[PDB]
Design a protein around this ligand. Sequence first.
Ligand SMILES: Nc1ncnc2c1ncn2[C@@H]1O[C@H](COP(=O)(O)OP(=O)(O)CP(=O)(O)O)[C@@H](O)[C@H]1O
Ligand SMILES: [Mg+2]
Ligand SMILES: [Mg+2]
Length: 293
Amino acid sequence: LPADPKWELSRARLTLGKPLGEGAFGQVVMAEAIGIDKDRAAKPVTVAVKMLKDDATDKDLSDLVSEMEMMKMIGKHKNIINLLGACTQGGPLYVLVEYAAKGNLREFLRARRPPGLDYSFDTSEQLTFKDLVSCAYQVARGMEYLASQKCIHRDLAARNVLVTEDNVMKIADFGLARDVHNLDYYKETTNGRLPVKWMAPEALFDRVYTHQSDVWSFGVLLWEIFTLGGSPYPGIPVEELFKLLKEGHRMDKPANCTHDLYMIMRECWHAAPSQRPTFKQLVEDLDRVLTVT
Ligand SMILES: Nc1ncnc2c1ncn2[C@@H]1O[C@H](COP(=O)(O)OP(=O)(O)CP(=O)(O)O)[C@@H](O)[C@H]1O
Ligand SMILES: [Mg+2]
Ligand SMILES: [Mg+2]
């Protein structure tokens, strides 16, 4: 594994801590990192360390490397999870990223659903319409930046948006992200995980991804936000989801969602990718919704 001194942090500077979250092949743990902050007086930075699980393969490893490399070219933005460094030498690969205290967006929204009339929870503030639109607006801003970096995310979803102590949204998980520089589109040529319920039709059969296929995913994300962590196309087998999408089926309007937002959501889900709004447009339309509320 080739060294990159620019990003390398020696693992002796790193003390591993409590678990943050995980999935099938990767896990993320809290840690303390010494030397990240240039102010030497007050220290050490709390970071999140992403690493492979024990049953992970060589393929999982090269995917985590690619993920790390993608974050290197991206550039820093308020609404994008920050790469802080990496331990690539003499030990397991650790990818160091900015710590988001409030976990992922899906779990953040779910923990704020009300109990229902006549019921109370017993042990752990309600979100407003404005809070939720804010969430949408912040992600749209980060995606707008991401597209200007000529990078497509391909896995935009509530489970991949993080929340800081200040309720700032940070897009995370660049596992499927691709460099689209000097490309009109990206064409998938392998087999690997696909986030089916978040994928535009054209991505699902032509295996063709653009910024516009990311916008489709944002639309699904919108639906997640306004159902406070709902799971897309509930009760629908995947094999059929796709005939349904062809036939012009789209998800119904969530109960919290206003008409204006559902139209925004619906525009993202246009059959023709050229008729979906750009992220820049999405930032505009969501700023408006927010300016007059
Ligand atoms: N910087 C961070 N700060 C706090 N928590 C984080 C974090 N990064 C990730 N997490 C937590 O770990 C979970 C999984 O993160 P991530 O999406 O990066 O891994 P992953 O989806 O690639 C695992 P797999 O590929 O095995 O399915 C997140 O949903 C979140 O709960
Ligand atoms: Mg993820
Ligand atoms: Mg992953």
